[PDB]
Amino acid sequence: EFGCDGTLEQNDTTREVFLRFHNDVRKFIALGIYPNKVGVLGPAKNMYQLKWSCDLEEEAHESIYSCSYNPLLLHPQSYSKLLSVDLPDTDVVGATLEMWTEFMRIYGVNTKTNSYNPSFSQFANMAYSKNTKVGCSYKKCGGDTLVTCVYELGVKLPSHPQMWENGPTCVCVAYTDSICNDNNLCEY
Amino acid sequence: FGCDGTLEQNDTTREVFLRFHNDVRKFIALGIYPNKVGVLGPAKNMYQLKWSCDLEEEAHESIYSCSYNPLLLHPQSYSKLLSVDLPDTDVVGATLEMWTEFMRIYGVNTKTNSYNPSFSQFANMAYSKNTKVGCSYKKCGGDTLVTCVYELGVKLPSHPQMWENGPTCVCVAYTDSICNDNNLCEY
Ligand SMILES: *[C@@H]1O[C@H](CO)[C@@H](O[C@@H]2O[C@H](CO)[C@@H](O[C@@H]3O[C@H](CO)[C@@H](O)[C@H](O)[C@H]3NC(C)=O)[C@H](O)[C@H]2NC(C)=O)[C@H](O[C@@H]2O[C@@H](C)[C@@H](O)[C@@H](O)[C@@H]2O)[C@H]1NC(C)=O
Ligand SMILES: *[C@@H]1O[C@H](CO)[C@@H](O[C@@H]2O[C@H](CO)[C@@H](O)[C@H](O)[C@H]2NC(C)=O)[C@H](O[C@@H]2O[C@@H](C)[C@@H](O)[C@@H](O)[C@@H]2O)[C@H]1NC(C)=O
């Protein structure tokens, strides 16, 4: 599920944190039980399972390599700079991902449109229903640690801000020959 | 710690909670804790926190039903997290880091060090005159609840100051205070 050989300064423990965090968020949106600011997100039809992409992880790694964020702009990308602390790497990674979702919970999703909002831009990239690939990276840059995820597909702003379509769990039709896996997420 | 109660927590996460708080507080006291721009502090009357099993009880009780219901006896910080398949210490660490990162998103006004609801958890953690904290967490299926209870905190509107600007180791808020080896006040 990973197999990323490169000089990426990361091993699979944090990659699994990244990957399963995304797919847990997406499963609970699809099931209609992820908590909004008030109430719940979802259910969503067309919410696809994410797979790791080593190419996208390289894009994530390259954007923070110099210790100043510089995205390649080939793919949607979420980024945050956190204070480096004397705790394990899973803690920074976890803190970033939790923070990305708390932005959403602090501001609140309109669950009629499920539109992107700049105040939870990272959550929108993480929840974008029709994406199927993610790659993330982090780098300690002295007093700060940069954490960033890159996605194959994302919202297209401003015209197409919808993060996911309201619909029944396991309705998987956005790609031909899609099935719903045991995670309650679509795959193709 | 010595918290005997049915608190569903052991001392390893208690230490992460406590040490994290006192690191932040001493970095503010020394004037080296990063703000959004620049640094926070130095602060006078920044007291070291001690654990309180009573406050931990108040924390544990507010979340044991998996819906947040504070007792409202003491200032309290709370977050509902997405559950992660990581050791509990790392979920606690991630939460505490996240609480500080809110502050650096909005930024503290270092002329006033005023409370800001947008970083309420950092504010509760940084409140200089508090000396006791109790924290708890509970895995609730897909989500995890994490919360800290403080004996003292800001009082709005009358006392919005998280800490007062001033020299490290000035410890006069309470009589018979001293500055310990952590450069934090205690009595
Ligand atoms: C990704 O890298 C991290 C950081 O190196 C790995 O986590 C570390 O894994 C090592 C073991 O390979 C842990 O060390 C050992 O800890 C135990 C308990 O104290 C002791 O028996 C042993 O003496 C100790 N070794 C030494 C010399 O210290 C280490 O504690 C652990 N965490 C950190 C922050 O260093 C990680 O390994 C994965 O996670 C650990 C927790 C184990 O489950 C391990 O089997 C896993 O592979 C690396 N991930 C991968 C996939 O390799
Ligand atoms: C609190 O609960 C933790 C989870 O059960 C304990 O960690 C576990 O300790 C085992 C040895 O007793 C060790 O083999 C396990 O890998 C470890 N599990 C995890 C997820 O870390 C913890 O014990 C403390 O921490 C571990 C890492 C060791 O250093 C122990 O010697 C420690 O006591 C429990 N804490 C206490 C104070 O009992």
Author numbering:
A (entry chain A): 2 to 189
B (entry chain B): 3 to 189
Copy the relevant paper text:
Proteomic analysis of ES products of adult H. polygyrus revealed that the most abundant proteins are members of the venom allergen-like protein (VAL) family, and among the major ones is H. polygyrus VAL-4 (HpVAL-4). VALs are members of the superfamily that is known as CAP (cysteine-rich secretory protein/antigen 5/pathogenesis related-1) or SCP/TAPS (Sperm-coating protein/Tpx/antigen 5/pathogenesis related-1/Sc7). There are >30 secreted Heligmosomoides polygyrus VAL proteins (HpVALs) and these proteins are characterised by having either one or two 15 kDa CAP (cysteine-rich secretory protein (CRISP)/antigen 5/pathogenesis related-1) domains. HpVAL-4 has both palmitate-binding and sterol-binding cavities and is able to complement the in vivo sterol export phenotype of yeast mutants lacking their endogenous CAP proteins.
